[PDB]
Amino acid sequence: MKLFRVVKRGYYISYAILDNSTIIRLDEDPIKALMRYSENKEVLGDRVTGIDYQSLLKSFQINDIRITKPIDPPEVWGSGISYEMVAKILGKTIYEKVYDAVRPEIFFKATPNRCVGHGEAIAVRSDSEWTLPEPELAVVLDSNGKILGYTIMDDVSARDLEAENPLYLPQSKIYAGCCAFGPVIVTSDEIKNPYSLDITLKIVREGRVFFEGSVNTNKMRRKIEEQIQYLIRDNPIPDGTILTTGTAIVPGRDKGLKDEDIVEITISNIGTLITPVKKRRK
Amino acid sequence: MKLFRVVKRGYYISYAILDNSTIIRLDEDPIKALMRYSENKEVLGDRVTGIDYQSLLKSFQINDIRITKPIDPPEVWGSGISYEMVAKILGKTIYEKVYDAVRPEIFFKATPNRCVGHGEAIAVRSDSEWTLPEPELAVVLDSNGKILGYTIMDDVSARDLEAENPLYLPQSKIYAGCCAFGPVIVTSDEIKNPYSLDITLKIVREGRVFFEGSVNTNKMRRKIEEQIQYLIRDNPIPDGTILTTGTAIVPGRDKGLKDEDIVEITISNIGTLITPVKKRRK
Amino acid sequence: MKLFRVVKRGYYISYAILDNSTIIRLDEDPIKALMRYSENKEVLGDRVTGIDYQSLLKSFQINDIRITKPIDPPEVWGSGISYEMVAKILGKTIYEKVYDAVRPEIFFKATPNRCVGHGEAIAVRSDSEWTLPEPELAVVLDSNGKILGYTIMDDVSARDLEAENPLYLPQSKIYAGCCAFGPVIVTSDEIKNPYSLDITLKIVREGRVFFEGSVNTNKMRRKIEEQIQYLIRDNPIPDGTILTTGTAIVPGRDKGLKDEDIVEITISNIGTLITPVKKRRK
Amino acid sequence: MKLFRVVKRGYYISYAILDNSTIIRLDEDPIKALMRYSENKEVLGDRVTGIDYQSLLKSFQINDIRITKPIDPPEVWGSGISYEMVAKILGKTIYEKVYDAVRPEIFFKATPNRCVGHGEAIAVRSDSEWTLPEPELAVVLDSNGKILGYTIMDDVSARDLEAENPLYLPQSKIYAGCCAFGPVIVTSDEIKNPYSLDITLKIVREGRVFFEGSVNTNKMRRKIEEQIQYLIRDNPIPDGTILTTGTAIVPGRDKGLKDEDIVEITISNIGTLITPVKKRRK
């Protein structure tokens, strides 16, 4: 099952694609719907025609329906340095110490209103000279830490403020439009092996491929279930929480984002998340 | 006005004390009520007798009413190193670089369900050997960053995990019972000078004053309005957000919290916030 | 307990008077509150001062509080010809046949929005030349038919349309402002004997006692519990239904109501319900 | 447009048939949806397949969907003696006086919870020996009295209690299961001439046509818009009110309903409303 959501005259409607490319309109709340599928694979709703999923992906809007965030995630948490490869602890950089330590990095990324979806604008902080997208695999979680599905997430990071001091990390990570995900949430059975997926980042400036990069999830050192385990320890998370698993694609110092740019992120079996860039006014 | 809230048979009731020690039961939501007072000092409700504010402070519960968090803060943000006085940037420690830099530290502290109030238990992470309370002045904010009132907050911090690596800071700061505040929210006109208040920390173990410390807010280097300014920049905050302003009282390596302890925090004009300690099971 | 309700800035607040003239503000819905008292006589709320019940009765409004209907009755049912003393069945008038028959009269009187309260205007139909108030004792009922309390009701009746044909009875009885009740609902234990109460009707025109009449409930032939029994038979009634028990005070053909009139109805132990009259425009 | 509604796992879903036999699932509340069509004929929703309208009509339930009342009518009002052809006024029977008078009969029939729909059981009062169905054309109304659509209604009447005394009419007309309507609500443009429709009543006992009768609406003396006019005069009605227009098909004294019977009512362009009969236990 692949689940997406549209906004129509100020209200939401959630749809799901079954393997045979038939579209079902959901009776239930999308998060609630994912928990059900996670148990017995039952889907409650009616089969619809006239919903052009393929056009929605390309054109975002058709008539009076517009695609958006597939769900409203109550909490979004991140996890950095999970692939194989200035502030320093006794000679070693903080990043490489965490790479080797038992305890992974876990941080609070976003609230639902700080997130955007397919075809909506991510933002660059008014006071950042160097902001990069971080293309990551992300998981949707229930309150016990059970994986309800997968999606593409863009962990938008004001890399310059982070470099200045690791104590500025929250300011670098949490802001309006700091996070984008979609275009769907694929159920768990739609991905046989999560550690064998291709993630591709493209930044597009005035029709020009300004950056192109790729990495496969088989290069992920720190496994997903360990990230989950450390996230939920003594820490209650609501149903529909998203944990974003980290990035391997890191553009250079010169590849910093700016106004009008287009960030396209592709992951096998999920699709391509396209977000325009809007630079904040001081 | 001094505003508190009780839980009675599974529902909340909000009350407010006017200077002449008369208690008013509120018609409005407490956050909504604070926004009103912030404009024209109007309070909507009826005068009540039989509500023993003074007993509630000492005994927490009377008959079927129990005092709790005065409001449900949609977001709680912290701000460290704001008073005058290992990871390091070119010789200098990360903490002292932020002490001198233009940009203050701002971090996401808690969601409302991760907070507790007067007479409820703060927690120590199951995997922390050294956790300290951080006694701080805290402000209640509207969406524009206007100060709606003041309160006492305990920024409960797993100091050992933080010391190990600054990237563990979120794990050290965000968990169930990681934050406590109360016992009231005092309106802005109840504090003529916020930079002239006495904050006192006491940890009590088996009847014993295990730690006692004090500092006055006139020692606050980084001012409050600057913390607000940096918090809201490109970052939308909901009505009733609490920003906690930082601590000067830091117990030693040997004064780490444990099960059954009592943390009492006193600030002039606000009162005394008392929270028992509960140590988490692995 | 004597329970009343005010409207304050577009919202309701319910209060209750305990025998010792102390006023309690209710935590619960008034209908829900009556069901509780009906079981164990428990009242949930806080004691208030500054609510001037006695002024409210006389002046209707004080500052920003105005007295109104004590509850929103989901259904209002009437019962005619219950005291001892043209359409006709085999010589006898329909009214006198029902007087003698086993089966009492039961009719649907009003929906909640067709009702008004103490100090609000009852109406006369635009097409009625002869409308009279019918001063009656009324009972508040739970879904099983248990008496939750008593009140005063004015069954406002377009007597001329009724006289023309008994099939016009619904049109004579159901309209905007066709019904008024209050000023309180007295709990069941506040009336030792319901069949020993004085009901008094006064119509007041330009300061003038235009009509004065009285009757005692000891003259009630058809008992209340029989009316209840016939009302609920095969007929589900919601909690807080009001059944009005019938009238003995009937003004003459010349005493028909008109614009600006004042209808005052008094019953022992309950009080005096005052409603101005407004004549409808064609 | 022809609009119906199902109950599925404790919740409602509303569908509409467009002339070309395509089924649309509604985004809006059905009453709200009818008001929209009444203005500009716009319908908000998605085209569905797999909803077998024709099976629903015949079998009531398929899988986990069951057809029911097409809407929840806030108020149901009746109107008797509207076709061309003991209590008496000066020699003439009350019924024939109303037949000739300017003022039609209007009565309150039911609340929504006293109504049932296609395939659900109408009831006979436990104390009625002679109850008949009254097959009528019914209109759905907005608050101004504008006709939003048409439906079939069964005005179930305890004819014996009515005959005994016209003051028992409410008891004869208002009870649990006293009213049934459906199976759809047809929009106004689906009926070119409301005064040219065939209404057919069949009572079925153990496979046997126990009664069969028919009449055409061209025999309706008292017109519909006059009934509306008299209904709303000084009397506010909510959106989605149903007014039932009266019957011409009256079975004999021997054709009284009983347990297990099947009442089938057919009207041109609307369909056939089928309701089993359940006799009440004393």
d(CA B152, CA B267): 7
C-alpha distances out from residue A95 to A53, A81, A102, C50, Å: 41, 7, 13, 65
E runs forming strands in chain D:
2-8, 11-18, 22-26, 45-49, 61-62, 65-67, 76-78, 87-89, 92-93, 107-110, 115-116, 122-124, 135-141, 147-155, 179-187, 198-205, 208-216, 241-244, 262-267, 271-279
d(CA A19, CA A269): 11
Same domain as A150, residue A240: yes
Q: Which residues of B touch A127 (CB under 8 A)?
A: 233-234
Same domain as C144, residue C48: no
Helix (H) or strand (E) holding A69: none
**Three-class SS state of C5:** strand
Q: Shortest CA distance to B173 belongs to which of B282, B250, B80, B89?
A: B80
φ/ψ (deg, to 5) at D36: -65, -50
d(CA C224, CA C147): 10
Q: What is the 3-state secondary structure (H, E, C) of A146-208?
A: CEEEEEEEEECECHHHHHHCHHHHHHHHCCCCCEEEEEEEEEHHHCCCCCCCEEEEEEEECCE
Can you say how many angstroms the Cα of residue D26 is from the centroid of all Cα atoms in its chain? 23
Whether the CB-CB separation of C38 and C146 falls below 8 Å is answered with yes
d(CA C91, CA C68): 46
Q: How many CB atoms lie within 10 A of CB C239?
A: 18
Measure C267 CA to nearest chain D CA, in Å.
28
Query: Is C210 in the D-facing interface, judged by CB distances under 8 Å?
Result: no
Domain-ending residue, one of A70, A97, A122: A70
Asked if the Cβ–Cβ distance from D48 to A47 is below 8 Å, we say yes
Say which DSSP state C57 is in: H
Residue ranges making up the domain that contains B228: 71-282
Same domain as B218, residue B99: yes
Whether the CB-CB separation of A274 and A119 falls below 8 Å is answered with yes
Long-range contacts of A259-264 (CB under 8 A, 24+ apart): A259/A124, A260/A205, A260/A206, A261/A203, A261/A204, A261/A205, A261/A210, A262/A202, A262/A203, A262/A204, A262/A205, A263/A122, A263/A133, A263/A154, A263/A201, A263/A202, A263/A203, A263/A204, A264/A200, A264/A201, A264/A202, A264/A203, A264/A204
φ/ψ (deg, to 5) at D82: -120, -5
Say which DSSP state D270 is in: T
Q: Shortest CA distance to C170 belongs to which of D227, D135, D109, D134?
A: D109
Whether the CB-CB separation of C172 and C158 falls below 8 Å is answered with yes
Contacts of D174 (CB under 8 A, 6+ apart): C108, C235, D108, D109, D110, D114
Q: Which residues of B touch A125 (CB under 8 A)?
A: 233-234
φ/ψ (deg, to 5) at D109: -95, -55
Same domain as B151, residue B210: yes
Measure C47 CA to nearest chain B CA, in Å.
6
One-letter amino acid of D147: I
**Three-class SS state of C47:** strand
Whether the CB-CB separation of C135 and C199 falls below 8 Å is answered with yes
Instruction: Judge if the upstream peptide bond of residue B133 is cis by omega within 30 degrees of 0.
Output: no
φ/ψ (deg, to 5) at B161: -60, -35
Q: What is the DSSP pairing of strand B241-244 with strand B135-141?
A: antiparallel
* Exposure b/e, C128-164, CB count within 10 A at least 16 = b: bebbbbbbbbbbbbbeebebbbbbbbbbbbbbbbbeb
The shares of helix, strand and coil residues in chain C, as percent rounded to the nearest 5, are 20, 40, 40
Whether the CB-CB separation of D12 and D6 falls below 8 Å is answered with yes
| Window B:93-112, CB contacts with A under 8 Å | 94-95, 97-98, 101, 103, 105-108, 111
For A132, how many CA atoms within 13 A lie in the half-sphere containing its CB? 24
Q: Shortest CA distance to B22 belongs to which of B5, B39, B46, B44?
A: B46
Q: Which residues of D touch A13 (CB under 8 A)?
A: 27, 46
Whether the CB-CB separation of A153 and A181 falls below 8 Å is answered with yes
| Window A:8-37, CB contacts with D under 8 Å | 8-9, 11, 13, 25, 27
Same domain as B176, residue B146: yes
Q: Shortest CA distance to A180 belongs to which of A160, A152, A219?
A: A152
Q: Which two tokens stand for residue B248?
A: 């000067």
B204: left (phi over 0), alpha (psi -120 to 50) or beta: beta
* Exposure b/e, B43-57, CB count within 10 A at least 16 = b: bbbbebeebeeeebb
Q: Which residues of A touch D48 (CB under 8 A)?
A: 25, 46-49
Mutate which of D126, D230, D234, D280 to disrupt the C interface (most C C-beta within 10 Å)? D234
Query: Exposed, middle or buried by CB within 10 Å (0-12, 13-18, 19+), for A107?
Result: buried
Same domain as D192, residue D59: no
Domain-ending residue, one of D10, D36, D70: D70
Query: Is B92 in the A-facing interface, judged by CB distances under 8 Å?
Result: no
Same domain as B80, residue B137: yes
Strand arrangement, sheet containing D198-205 = D122-124, D271-279, D262-267, D198-205, D208-216
Query: Exposed, middle or buried by CB within 10 Å (0-12, 13-18, 19+), for A200?
Result: middle
Whether the CB-CB separation of D273 and D135 falls below 8 Å is answered with no
Can you say how many angstroms the Cα of residue B194 is from the centroid of all Cα atoms in its chain? 15
**B173, B176, B178, B181 alpha-carbon torsion, rounded to 10°:** 140
Whether the CB-CB separation of B183 and B118 falls below 8 Å is answered with yes
Say which DSSP state D194 is in: T
> By what technique were these coordinates determined?
X-ray
Whether the CB-CB separation of A47 and A22 falls below 8 Å is answered with yes
Can you say how many angstroms the Cα of residue D42 is from the centroid of all Cα atoms in its chain? 25
Query: Is B44 in the A-facing interface, judged by CB distances under 8 Å?
Result: no
| Window C:221-260, CB contacts with D under 8 Å | 230, 233-236
Resolution (A): 3.0
φ/ψ (deg, to 5) at B167: -75, -10
Residue B209 sits in a domain whose CATH number is 3.90.850.10
Q: Which two tokens stand for residue D59?
A: 């079998």
d(CA B171, CA A149): 24
* Exposure b/e, B171-185, CB count within 10 A at least 16 = b: bbbbbbbbbbbbbbb
Decide: D and A in contact? Rule: 3+ Cβ pairs under 8 Å. yes
**Three-class SS state of C99:** helix
d(CA D27, CA B225): 47
Contacts of C240 (CB under 8 A, 6+ apart): C31, C34, C71, C72, C73, C74, C140, C141, C142, C148
d(CA D128, CA C160): 32
Long-range contacts of D19-26 (CB under 8 A, 24+ apart): D22/D47, D23/D47, D23/D48, D23/D49, D23/D51, D23/D53, D24/D48, D25/A25, D25/A46, D25/A48, D25/D51
Q: What is the DSSP pairing of strand D135-141 with strand D241-244?
A: antiparallel
* Exposure b/e, C190-221, CB count within 10 A at least 16 = b: bbeebeebebbbbbbbeeeebbebebebeebe
Q: What is the 3-state secondary structure (H, E, C) of B232-257?
A: HCCCCCCCCEEEECCCCCCCCCCCCC
User: For the residues of D43-104, what is the DSSP string, one character each?
Assistant: --EEEEES--HHHHHHHSEETTEEE--SS--S-EEE----B---EEETTEEHHHHHHHSSSP
Q: Which residues of A touch B103 (CB under 8 A)?
A: 161, 164-165, 168, 171
Asked if the Cβ–Cβ distance from D89 to C174 is below 8 Å, we say no
One-letter amino acid of B74: P
Whether the CB-CB separation of A200 and A223 falls below 8 Å is answered with no
Contacts of A126 (CB under 8 A, 6+ apart): A279, A280, A281, A282, B233, B234
Q: Which two tokens stand for residue B27?
A: 């018609």
d(CA D26, CA D225): 29
Mutate which of A167, A173, A282 to disrupt the B interface (most B C-beta within 10 Å)? A167
d(CA B53, CA D247): 69
For B106, how many CA atoms within 13 A lie in the half-sphere containing its CB? 25
Contacts of A117 (CB under 8 A, 6+ apart): A67, A68, A69, A70, A180, A181, A182, A183
**Three-class SS state of A83:** strand
Q: What is the DSSP pairing of strand B241-244 with strand B76-78?
A: parallel
Measure D254 CA to nearest chain C CA, in Å.
23
Q: Which chains touch D (3 or more CB pairs under 8 A)?
A: A, C
Q: How many CB atoms lie within 10 A of CB B266?
A: 17
d(CA D246, CA D240): 19
Q: Which chains touch C (3 or more CB pairs under 8 A)?
A: B, D
d(CA D276, CA C158): 40
C-alpha distances out from residue A171 to B78, B233, D163, Å: 12, 9, 82
Q: Which chains touch B (3 or more CB pairs under 8 A)?
A: A, C
Question: Do the annotations mark residue A134 as ligand-binding?
Answer: yes
d(CA C88, CA D92): 10
- In degrees, rounded to 5, the angle at the alpha carbon of residue A236 between the alpha carbons of residues A178 and A102 is 80
d(CA C10, CA B272): 38
Whether the CB-CB separation of B75 and B47 falls below 8 Å is answered with no
φ/ψ (deg, to 5) at B169: -50, -45
One-letter amino acid of D142: D
What is the residue whose two structure tokens read 């979680």? A141
D126: left (phi over 0), alpha (psi -120 to 50) or beta: alpha
For B23, how many CA atoms within 13 A lie in the half-sphere containing its CB? 17
d(CA B172, CA C151): 62
Whether the CB-CB separation of B82 and B199 falls below 8 Å is answered with no
Number of domains within chain C: 2
- In degrees, rounded to 5, the angle at the alpha carbon of residue A61 between the alpha carbons of residues A58 and A63 is 130
Q: Which two tokens stand for residue C42?
A: 């428990």
Query: Is B85 in the C-facing interface, judged by CB distances under 8 Å?
Result: no
Nearest-Cα residue of chain D relative to residue C230? D171
E runs forming strands in chain B:
2-8, 11-18, 22-26, 45-49, 61-62, 65-67, 76-78, 87-89, 92-93, 107-110, 115-116, 122-124, 135-141, 147-155, 179-187, 198-205, 208-216, 241-244, 262-267, 271-279
Q: Which residues of C touch D171 (CB under 8 A)?
A: 103, 106, 230
One-letter amino acid of A127: D
Q: Shortest CA distance to B147 belongs to which of B233, B234, B72, B37?
A: B37
Asked if the Cβ–Cβ distance from D166 to C125 is below 8 Å, we say no
d(CA A12, CA A5): 7
Whether the CB-CB separation of D16 and D24 falls below 8 Å is answered with yes
d(CA B100, CA B110): 27
φ/ψ (deg, to 5) at D191: -135, 100
Partners of residue A72 on adjacent β-strands: none
User: For the residues of C207-232, what is the DSSP string, one character each?
Assistant: TEEEEEEEEEGGGB-S-HHHHHHHHH
Contacts of D235 (CB under 8 A, 6+ apart): C174, C175, C176
Asked if the Cβ–Cβ distance from B230 to A174 is below 8 Å, we say no
Whether the CB-CB separation of A140 and A150 falls below 8 Å is answered with yes
C-alpha distances out from residue B279 to A144, B114, B117, D73, Å: 21, 15, 17, 58
Q: Shortest CA distance to D3 belongs to which of D15, D21, D18, D19?
A: D15
Q: How many CB atoms lie within 10 A of CB D225?
A: 10
Asked if the Cβ–Cβ distance from A125 to B175 is below 8 Å, we say no
Same domain as D133, residue D39: no
Helix (H) or strand (E) holding C115: strand C115-116
User: For the residues of B101-140, what is the DSSP string, one character each?
Assistant: SSSPP-EEEE-GGGEE-TTS-EEE-TT-S--B--EEEEEE
Partners of residue B203 on adjacent β-strands: B211, B263
Measure B94 CA to nearest chain C CA, in Å.
53
Helix (H) or strand (E) holding C183: strand C179-187
Question: Do the annotations mark residue D134 as ligand-binding?
Answer: yes
Domain-ending residue, one of D41, D70, D99: D70
d(CA D194, CA B269): 77
Q: How many CB atoms lie within 10 A of CB D252?
A: 9
φ/ψ (deg, to 5) at D167: -75, -10
Same domain as C200, residue C277: yes
Contacts of B82 (CB under 8 A, 6+ apart): B104, B220, B221, B222, B227, B245, B246
Asked if the Cβ–Cβ distance from C27 to B50 is below 8 Å, we say no
Q: Which residues of D touch A27 (CB under 8 A)?
A: 8, 11, 13
Nearest to A49 among D8, D9, D47 (CB): D47
Both ends of chain D: CA-CA distance in Å? 43
**Three-class SS state of B164:** helix
Long-range contacts of D54-59 (CB under 8 A, 24+ apart): D56/D4, D56/D6, D56/D183, D57/D118, D57/D183, D57/D271, D57/D272
Note the helical H segments in chain C: 30-40, 53-59, 94-100, 159-164, 169-173, 224-232
Q: Report how many helices (DSSP H) and strands (DSSP E) chain C contains, helices first.
A: 6, 20
What is the residue whose two structure tokens read 């606050």? B220
Whether the CB-CB separation of C110 and C179 falls below 8 Å is answered with yes
**D52, D56, D59, D62 alpha-carbon torsion, rounded to 10°:** 60
**Three-class SS state of B172:** helix
Same domain as D147, residue D48: no
Same domain as B87, residue B24: no
One-letter amino acid of D117: G
Say which DSSP state D172 is in: H
C-alpha distances out from residue A104 to A95, A96, A232, Å: 10, 11, 13
Q: Shortest CA distance to B166 belongs to which of B87, B76, B256?
A: B87
Same domain as D107, residue D61: no
Residue D51 sits in a domain whose CATH number is 3.10.330.40
Partners of residue C89 on adjacent β-strands: C92, D87
Measure B118 CA to nearest chain C CA, in Å.
22
Nearest to A47 among D13, D27, D49 (CB): D49
φ/ψ (deg, to 5) at C198: -95, 120
Measure C57 CA to nearest chain B CA, in Å.
19
- Binding-site residue set of B for Mg(2+): 134, 136, 155
Query: Is C91 in the B-facing interface, judged by CB distances under 8 Å?
Result: no
d(CA C49, CA D227): 53
Considering only the C-alpha atoms of chain A, give the largest distance between any 2 of them, rounded to a whole number of Å: 63
